[PDB]
Structures are given as C-alpha cells and as structure tokens.
Design a protein around this ligand. Structure first.
Ligand SMILES: Nc1nc2c(ncn2[C@@H]2O[C@H](COP(=O)(O)OP(=O)(O)CP(=O)(O)O)[C@@H](O)[C@H]2O)c(=O)[nH]1
Lengths: 85, 82, 132, 123, 262, 205
RNA sequence: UAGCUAGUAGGUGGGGUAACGGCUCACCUAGGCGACGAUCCCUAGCUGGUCUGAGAGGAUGACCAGCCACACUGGAACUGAGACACGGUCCAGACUCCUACGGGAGGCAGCAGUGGGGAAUAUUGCACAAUGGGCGCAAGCCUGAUGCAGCCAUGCCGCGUGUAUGAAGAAGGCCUUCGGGUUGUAAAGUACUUUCAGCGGGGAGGAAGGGAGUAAAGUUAAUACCUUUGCUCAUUGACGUUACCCGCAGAAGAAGCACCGGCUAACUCCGUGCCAGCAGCCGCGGUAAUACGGAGGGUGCAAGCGUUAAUCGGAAUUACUGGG
C-alpha cells in the first residue's frame, strides 16, 4: 500500500540478512560442538565450547537471544561435555 | 505504562469526567484498574463540586503512575495547605 | 508586472459551435495531437521521452458516432493554456450551448460548403450577437 | 413425577412453528405476484375471493389474499405482501398491502383509511 | 496546425461578466464560479453531479471554503477535478480562467452563484420551456428504485425534468428537445436497467411551473386534489393538458413570488 | 397533548361535575346534565366492572388533565413509594404545579392555570417553571412575576377563590399573589368523591 | 451419530519455545476416550447484561464494557518486549485498472459515499476547542477515536396547537312518534394572554492549560542556566445565527389515527343483498345489517395512531416450585 511509513519494511530487509547471518554463524559454532559430540574428543569439545561461549553470550547481549535460550545451550552442552569427559 | 487520567463520561453537552487509573494502551472508556474520585467541570458552587481521595493517588505515585495535566491541576486544586 | 495577471492573460476560452455533421469531434481530437503533441512537445525535452503507442493498424480501424453532450480539454500547450468546451450540435440538442456560450469569451465557427449557412448557423449567430 | 427420568432425559419445551414461513421473522415481503383469479371459499361463505399466487423474491411460492374493492393487477405489477391468515381460504395465510407498490389504493374510501392505503380526503 | 498561432495572437484576456451590481473584472477576488451544466454523467461507481465553473476571477486555493449564495452557507470544498486531456485528473489547483469539476450530491442546480460575501446574482440561465413527451411505464417492473432515483437524478439537468403525478404510475419524462433517445441509451448503465419503450400518449404544453405565496395556495391545492403533479425538485406546476386549463388557472389568480426554475 | 375541545361534554359523559367549566359563573344548568351525554344518551348501559373502572379512570384523568402514558408513569412512580399506592397516586396528582395554581385561585379553570404556568408567569422559589407537570416539593412558595402580575385575569378569577372550600394544605396571601405550599394532603381532604381503588384495579391487571 | 484414536496414550533420551509441554524427532509398551454421550452432522462468537416473569424459569446478548477470532481466500516467515500482523512483506488463486504490453497497482468486515440484496437503516460535514493515544525537554504536528453538526417521530420524555365569558339554546348535517332531540359553549361575538415557531438585541458554561515578563525558594563557584510556586499582560470554542434572558406583532403558523355484536371502551340511519365485503376467536352479510360501504354521533390514544414480524406472561397447555 502507498504509505509514507514504508521505511520500516526495507530497513527490516536490512535486518533480515545481517542479524540473521549472525544467528547463522552462531548456530554453526553450536553445530561444531555437536561435531565434537560425534567425535569423542573431550579436549576438542572443551576448546569448541570455549570458542562458542563468548559469541553466544554476545548474541544474548545484543537482543537477538533472550538470555535463556543461550543459557539452555550452555547448560545442556556443558552437561554433555562433562558427561563425555 | 499506567497513568491517572480523565475518562469523559456524562451526557451529550453534559460532561462528567472520571479521574481513574488505567493503562495507556487501554481506551478512554475502556478497561481500568480502579476508580478514585471524580470531577465535574460544569459543577457550579453547590453542596459538592469535586471529590478526590489523595491516599490512593499517593499510592499510585509510589508505584510510578504518570500524572496528566488535568489531574495535576486537580491536585493543585485540592491543596495540602488550602 | 506580477506573474498572477501575466498568466491570467495566458488563459483563454474557445466557445466551439457549428452545424450538425460539421466536424467538432475530429478537430478536437486533432488539437489533442495536437494537445497531446503539445504534451509531447512539453514532454519532447527531458532525459527521456514517453508517448502512447501511435495506434497500430489492426486497432486503428475502429469507430463511434452521433456526438452529444460536451467535453472539456484544459491542455498543457506550450505558449498559453486555452480551454475547450464541447457541446452537442443539433436543434433538439444544444441547450447546453445557450448557457455555455455565455461562459466562453470567444467563438469558433465550423461551416461546411455542402451545408453552407443554414438555420443552425442563424440561430448560433442570434446567440452570439447578444454578447458581441 | 419420576424425577430420575428428568435427570436422564431433560424436560423439553415444545417448539411451535410460525404461522407464516417468512424467512427468519420479517414483517413484510415483496414478490412477483402472478396468477390473479377468484376462489370459492370454504363451507359457510360462498364468495368470489380475489387471490394471487405470489412468487416471492426469496424463492417461496405463497398465495396472498387481495383485499379491497377493485384492483389493477394482470400477471405483473410487483406489490408488497404482509402476514396474517384469512380463515376463509385453505392455503392462504397472507394479505396484500395497499398504499404500497404498483397496486394503487382503493378508490373513494373515507373510514378506516390507515388500512387499504387511502390518503386523507384533500377536498 | 495554423489555428494555434491565431488562438495565441487574436484572442484577448477573458472579459468581465455582468452581475446585478456591475461587471467583475479578472483581477479581483471572491471566486465567481457558478455552475453551468449538471451534465448527463458517465457513471463508473459514483455520480458527483459535475461543476463547470466561471473561475475567471481569482487564483485557486487547495483548502478554500466556498459560499453558497442562494442558500447562504459556508461550504468547505477541498476536492476539485481538473480536466487534463479529458480524463478527470487528480486534486489540483490552477490559474484563473479555468473550468473545474466538483463533487455534488443533489445540492446545486444550474446557475447557483458563488462569492466570498458578495451576495448578488448574475444575468444567466437562458434555459427554455419543455415540450412534454410521453411517459415511464416500467417494463420488467422489478426494482423501481433505479428509476425513482436515477431519472430523478437526471431531473436536475436542463434537458430532463421528471414530472411525478399523484397516481404513482405514468411518470412523465421532461424533454425540451424532441429526441428522447438520449435517456433511453442512458437507461443501460451500471445503475440503470429498465427499458421503457415508447408509444404515443398526449400531454400537451410544458407544465408552467408556479409556486404561490402562503395562506393562498392551500385552497388552490384543495379544490382540484386530483389535478396536481409533483416535479423534479418538489414543485407543482399546475397540470398541463390543454390551453383552456391554463386560461382557467389564470382566471383563478395565483398571486406568486415567481421563479421560473427553467 | 391538550384536549382543547368540548370540556363540558365530558362532565355530561361522566355525569358528575368535572370542574372543567368552573369559571366566574356558578353551576350553569345550561347543558342538560346527567340526561344527555350525547346523541343516544337516553340509553341505560349494562355498566360492567371494566366499564366502571374505565369511567372512573377517565373521570379522574379529565379532572386532572393527565394523558394516559403520563398517568401510567404516575402510577409507576406511586407503586414504588411507601404506604399505599392509592393515597400516593392522588398525592402525585395534587403535586402538579398547575393543580397548585388552580387551588390557589390563580385562574378560573384548570386550563387557565396551565396556560398561566406555561406563559412564564408562575414562579416557584424564584425560578420560573413552564411545565405544568412540575412536581411541587414540600415547603415551597409560589407567586407571579412583576411583569405578569395582575393584568386582571388573575383578579376576577381570584373572586372564585372566595367561593371555593380553600383547603388546609396551602395558603394564599391574596395581597401580593404569593402562595405558600405546605405538607402533603390527606386522602380524606381532597374532594371526598373520587375512587382510587378502581384505578388500582385497572392498572393492576 | 456407538464405537473413536496410530504422534494416538505413557515413559527414556536429543532438539525447540521468554517457559512446562508428543511442541518436535530416535527407542520401548499398548495404552487413551466413552452411555455421568467418546467420534460424526447442523447451528452459534462468549459474558457482564436486555426483555418478560411474584419467584423459579424462557428467549436474547443490538447499542455500553471485558475477552476471543478475522482483515478478498489460503499458507509462510522477518522486525520487536509484545504481530506469526486492517491501512507491513512474499507466494498461490479469483476479480478489476494501466501499459510504450517488457511488467506492475489494488484490497472500505475504517469514517463518509456507490452498485446489488432487502420491508428496512444516514452526510463523500466542522475541529483537535476538551479528553485520550503516538513523537518531541518543551513549544508545536497527526488523530473519520472523540467533541459535535445534518437526516430519520426509530424509542422515551415534555410543551403547544388557546383561555374566560358567550343562547337565538343561530346556520348546516343526522335521527324522529316530525312534539323535538343531537352535533352544541361547539361555532359566531366580546375580553385577555402568547409557551413553542418568525424577527431584532444581550449572553454564560463546557477552559484546564500553554506563551512572554517579574519576585521568592532549591541547584551550583555562580545573583548565569534549569525545576517548582505566587504574581502582571496578551490570550486559546467546531458546536455557535449556542443554552438562557429581554423586546416587536398578531389566536395569529401548528391534530390527527384506530374502533363501535361479545371478548373490550362506544349507537342509529341510508345503499346493496351469502354479492360487494370484514374478521385476532366465536363468526355476520340469503331485501328491516348495533359485524360490509357511506353519513351522523361516540369511544380510546395523542404527534402519534392502527396493521404486520419476534420474545415472555396469561400457559400449572412441558408441571423442579407446579400435571397425570
Ligand atoms: N474527409 C473529411 N471528413 C471530415 C472532415 N471533417 C469532418 N469529416 C467527416 O464529417 C463527419 C462529421 O463527424 P463529427 O466530427 O462527429 O461531426 P460533429 O461536428 O462532431 C457533429 P455535431 O455538430 O453534432 O457535434 C464525419 O463523418 C467525419 O468523418 C474533414 O476534414 N475531412
């Protein structure tokens, strides 16, 4: 529809790549740790967890993650990596 | 955001405001938490012109209710030393 | 020398009247080219020029007839902006033009040679002599 | 009595049907109104009751009684149909409204002129 | 192609036009745009009346508030159509000496004057007296309301003035010309679906419109209560079947504040 | 709203004097009372229960000048009051302003009192009242404003006030036309003839 | 409508939601609902409430208000605390419009308004003057919510359309036993008054605020800036030719609708003649009609009156109160 407030459409287009791409790279790091769960190497699992922890806390800080999803990821992933170790 | 505001009741060409605590997203005649006092702008000098209970108003100030201009003028009408 | 009156002077009126079967519609449609061309002339200079398809031969063929009422063309013409005002030309018709030749300052006559000066033209001149 | 049967099966109120099937409780209807003829009534009457088979605009085929003295109907002239039985014709449960559409009012009436569509005598 | 240079060079400024006081020039204010035609409109979904105007004096404003002089009311009109290349274009203001089109709904007749306070009238309306052709008899008599509105919609125009008799049938189409094929073709539109094919019925002479002053036309209504007829715009002329009845009407002496409406 | 018609035909119709033709003159005997209400008034009716109920209702109404919907509103107001409905209904009928103006003697008949109320002349408590259905509160004072005082129409009609019973529940000054309203009237004081019980019967069914 | 269910019922583990959750996947068992109505069909937004009814109940829930659902149809996601979105996005379908035919635009179940439907429902009006919402420190901006204005007797309420006097008991109509009665204090005449309309002048209240200037107290190094309170000035109204008040003139402009055999309030005459016709039921009209039509008169209601349509009561003729 013809409206002066169409700026929030294309700016959300400006959102739907970039922030989501951050979410994209976020979950790939998470999936990397699942590769360690399929690897059996507890040292590589600890290294991958230490690699994914500050970026998922930064994504919880920037309003994309509501700091309870990422807390659930840290909780169950810590439970997996110390059940394996 | 809760606020204390008038509700505009009455009849046609006969206003009768209801100072009331309500959320800002609600309507004027819509949902409210509780009512406290009233105001009648066409109330000439007679037995009663304005009732206003300041205790619940102070309780909502202690909770964070934003006071509008007309309600603040009614507070300055019901003065502590006058 | 205010531009308000200078473009009051750029607004003119053509009454437009004639005999039945004289050619009001064709001359107005060609002043649209004419006016449309004036639009094209106005649209002639710019970064790009856009004109409606010059109508194609297959659809060029089609037609309508018998006139009636009137139409108004303001125009975008280059020099001035001179309005038109059509009217149905008959004896049973044209009660529009008895009150809209009062609207229009000037007068255009269209007379055919096969028709000549007839009672339609005498009635229109009886109208136009009252206001000069 | 026997209230345990009322516990099993609840007490049902009889739903009486309407005397006029007028498509969800309307006051008046408008129809095509064909077939204008006179009808011999039931036993104690012996009259010529002017009636019309009105094809209504909702699909129902009702037959309304033509009241008054004189009318201008011939297979046409869409009119208004009101409810109310006649107790004179088996199957006729409607009346025709005068002062309504193409059927004009009754000529030269003075009394009871709210019914039959007659205006006030202007002379 | 050679006409355009003559149109530029020969035609003068738009002349002043006569009012009851004096001629109003093309440099003043108080927009003199009175309505000329109420034209037989093509109807996409709406009517709009049409408002051809004499806005020769005064440059437009977008939020201007006109004044209906004959009803003396301040009417706010912000929508004004310009006839750019025949198509009714957007909301646009212009330079004076142009002809608009506005949006009316049964309010403004032919020649209703407009100013911003000059409560005077022009010297127009050269419209004539009709010649009464036949009838409306409602073939396919379903849905009368398209002719009870839509031809009464056409009754405000200078060509058509619909006459309603009391008997609620046989409505007379007013023609000042002869060819009523215009209305017959206009009966095939989006809000026009009734045919009404013509025949020969004799109603003679033009129905001279007259509305007398109070306390005196009441008995004139009462003595011939079967001889009245409503008009387009709630008028009552007399009824015109012959010249002898008009002579009896002149013998009856209806003293009147006379307005022709034609 | 108002009847404005044959006000003396109603007195023949009910048989009793409804005081619609009270006037300056006394009891007229100019209409052949009790023996000719109309064209066929020589007939003796069956006069059933609903008949005497309707005659009593229309008798009290054409005494007090109240229409049917308005009197039904008065009955609905009297039904929710304390005591009994029959005394309360006649108290509400007496509480009309035009009835008070009639009892003061400010006008010969009741329609004259209604016209005197309606034409901005009757003023109670310093506030002018035009509606004749004004519910008169106890302890009020009624008078006539100075611009409409004694243009003779109150004057000779006040002489009729010297011939009436002059009841207890209201006092007139008769020197400056300033009346004084008092406590509500008892049932055994107002006219001693009308029957409220038939009205209760008619409005109870 | 007597069987329904296979992500179905439960558990373990992984993933997912702001959060429990077969919410979603891998494995194991056969459970789960059901005659105190499971599954299927039709209908329906729900409620506070409305109408009726002594009460219990019955229909309804349109306007006021709370919740839910929807935005031409269906599906899907992003933004954000909150949408899986009326005036945001995309795709698929239908219907219109433009095109220079390569491609795009649209969604009034918003306010207005139009076509169609139907017995039936409004103006393409004024303004943020007041409230409320959004943004801004504030001034200011938007607000078809709202405050109103216009139309509709749609419902309720009030007022008026005169009052007092006035017999020759006039004229005309109706009846008659042609004596007379009725219409009828009705009308004419006389004396007053003018509610409401018409016109001419004053004129509140809905108006709190906000702006400029000054003084005092806080703040601070600061008599500078900023907050707050008195105080001085110019002020902010669409309604609005406002409510209301005064004056001018003249009873002057303002009364109709149903019924009259019983139910149920009210009587005759004339015209047909089981015909025209009326009727809610009993039913009348067959040449002396209190039942049709007309006239007179009366009754009832009143700017409304009758008819039609729907709910309740009467109907204890759905009996739980309260039947056999
Ligand atoms: N060859 C030719 N034919 C012409 C010319 N002008 C008009 N015509 C023809 O004459 C006829 C007039 O048509 P039209 O334009 O409708 O006439 P009109 O003046 O509008 C009719 P009315 O006066 O009623 O409004 C048509 O058949 C048209 O083709 C011309 O210059 N050349």
């Amino acid at each position: 529809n013809i409206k002066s407030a169409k700026k929030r459409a294309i700016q959300s287009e400006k959102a739907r790549k970039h922030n989501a791409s951050r979410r994209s790279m976020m979950r790939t790091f998470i999936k990397k740790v699942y590769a360690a769960i399929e690897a059996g190497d507890k040292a590589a699992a600890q290294k991958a967890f230490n690699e994914m922890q500050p970026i998922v806390d930064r994504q919880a800080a920037k309003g994309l993650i509501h700091k309870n999803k990422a807390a659930r990821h840290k909780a169950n992933l810590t439970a997996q990596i110390n059940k394996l170790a | 955001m809760v606020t204390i505001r008038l509700a505009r009741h009455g009849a046609k060409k006969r206003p009768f405001y209801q100072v009331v605590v309500a959320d800002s997203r609600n309507a004027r005649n819509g949902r409210f938490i509780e009512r406290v006092g009233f105001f009648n702008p066409i109330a000439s000098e007679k037995e009663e012109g304005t009732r206003l209970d300041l205790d619940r108003i102070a309780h909502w100030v202690g909770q964070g209710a934003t006071i509008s201009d007309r309600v603040a003028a009614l507070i300055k009408e019901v003065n502590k030393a006058a | 020398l205010s531009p308000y009156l200078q473009e009051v002077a750029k607004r003119r009126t053509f009454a437009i009247i004639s005999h039945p079967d004289a050619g009001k519609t064709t001359i107005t449609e060609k002043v649209l080219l004419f006016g449309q061309a004036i639009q094209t002339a106005g649209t002639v200079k710019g970064r790009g020029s856009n004109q409606h398809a010059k109508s194609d031969w297959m659809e060029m063929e089609k037609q309508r007839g018998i006139s009636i009422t009137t139409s108004v063309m303001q125009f975008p013409y280059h020099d001035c902006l001179v309005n038109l005002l059509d009217t149905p030309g008959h004896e049973d018709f044209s009660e529009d033009t008895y009150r809209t030749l009062t609207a229009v300052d000037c007068c255009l006559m269209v007379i055919d040679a096969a028709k000549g000066v007839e009672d339609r033209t005498r009635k229109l001149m009886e109208v136009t002599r009252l206001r000069d | 009595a026997t209230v345990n049967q009322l516990v099993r099966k609840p007490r049902a109120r009889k739903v009486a049907k309407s005397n006029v099937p007028a498509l969800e409780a309307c006051p008046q209807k408008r129809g095509v109104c064909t077939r204008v003829y006179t009808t011999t009534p039931k036993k104690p009457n012996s009259a010529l009751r002017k009636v019309c088979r009105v094809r209504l605009t909702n699909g129902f085929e009702v037959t309304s009684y033509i009241g008054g003295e004189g009318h201008n109907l011939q297979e046409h002239s869409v009119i208004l149909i009101r409810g109310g039985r006649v107790k004179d014709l088996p199957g006729v449960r409607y009346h025709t409204v005068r002062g309504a559409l193409d059927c004009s009012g009754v000529k030269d009436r003075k009394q009871a002129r709210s019914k039959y569509g007659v205006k006030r005598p202007k002379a | 192609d050679h006409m355009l240079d003559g149109l530029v060079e020969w035609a003068p400024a738009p002349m002043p036009r006569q009012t009851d006081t004096r001629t109003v020039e093309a440099s003043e204010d108080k927009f003199t745009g009175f309505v000329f035609k109420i034209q037989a409109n093509m109807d996409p979904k709406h009517r709009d009346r049409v408002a051809f105007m004499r806005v020769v004096s005064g440059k437009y404003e977008k939020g201007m508030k006109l004044r209906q002089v004959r009803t003396a009311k301040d009417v706010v009109i912000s929508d004004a159509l310009t006839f750019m290349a025949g198509d009714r274009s957007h909301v646009e203001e212009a330079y004076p000496g142009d002809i608009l089109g506005l949006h009316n709904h049964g309010t403004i007749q032919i020649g209703d004057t407009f100013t911003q306070g000059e409560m005077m009238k022009f010297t127009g309306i050269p419209n004539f007296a009709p010649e009464l052709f036949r009838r409306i008899r409602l073939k396919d008599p379903l849905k009368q309301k398209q002719l009870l509105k839509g031809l009464v919609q056409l009754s405000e125009e200078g060509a058509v003035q619909v006459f309603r008799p009391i008997s609620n049938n046989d409505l007379i189409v007013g023609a000042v010309g002869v060819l009523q094929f215009d209305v017959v073709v206009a009966r095939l539109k989006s809000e026009y679906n009734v045919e009404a094919v013509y025949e020969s019925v004799n109603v003679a002479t033009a129905r001279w419109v007259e509305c007398a002053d109070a306390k005196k036309f009441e008995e004139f209504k009462r003595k011939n209560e079967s001889q009245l007829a409503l008009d387009g715009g709630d008028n009552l002329a007399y009824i015109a079947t012959s010249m002898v009845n008009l002579r009896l009407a002149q013998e009856r002496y209806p003293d009147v504040q006379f307005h022709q409406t034609r | 709203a108002r009847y404005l018609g044959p006000k003396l035909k109603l007195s023949r119709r009910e048989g009793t004097d409804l005081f619609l033709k009270s006037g300056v003159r006394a009891i007229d005997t100019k209409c052949k009372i009790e023996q000719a209400p109309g064209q066929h008034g020589a007939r003796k009716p069956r006069l059933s229960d609903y008949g005497v109920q309707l005659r009593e209702k229309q008798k009290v109404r054409r005494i007090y000048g109240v229409l049917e919907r308005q009197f039904r509103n008065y009955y609905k107001e009297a039904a929710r009051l304390k005591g009994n409905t029959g005394e309360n209904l006649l108290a509400l009928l007496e509480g009309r302003l035009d009835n008070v103006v009639y009892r003061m003697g400010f006008g010969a008949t009741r329609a004259e009192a209604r016209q005197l109320v309606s034409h901005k002349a009757i003023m109670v408590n310093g506030r002018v009242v035009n509606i004749a259905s004004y519910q008169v509160s106890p302890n009020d004072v009624v008078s006539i404003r100075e611009k409409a005082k004694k243009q003779s129409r109150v004057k000779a009609a006040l002489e009729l006030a010297e011939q009436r019973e002059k009841p207890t529940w209201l006092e007139v000054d008769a020197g400056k036309m300033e009346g004084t309203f008092k406590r509500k009237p008892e049932r055994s004081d107002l006219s001693a003839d009308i029957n409220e019980h038939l009205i209760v019967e008619l409005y109870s069914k």
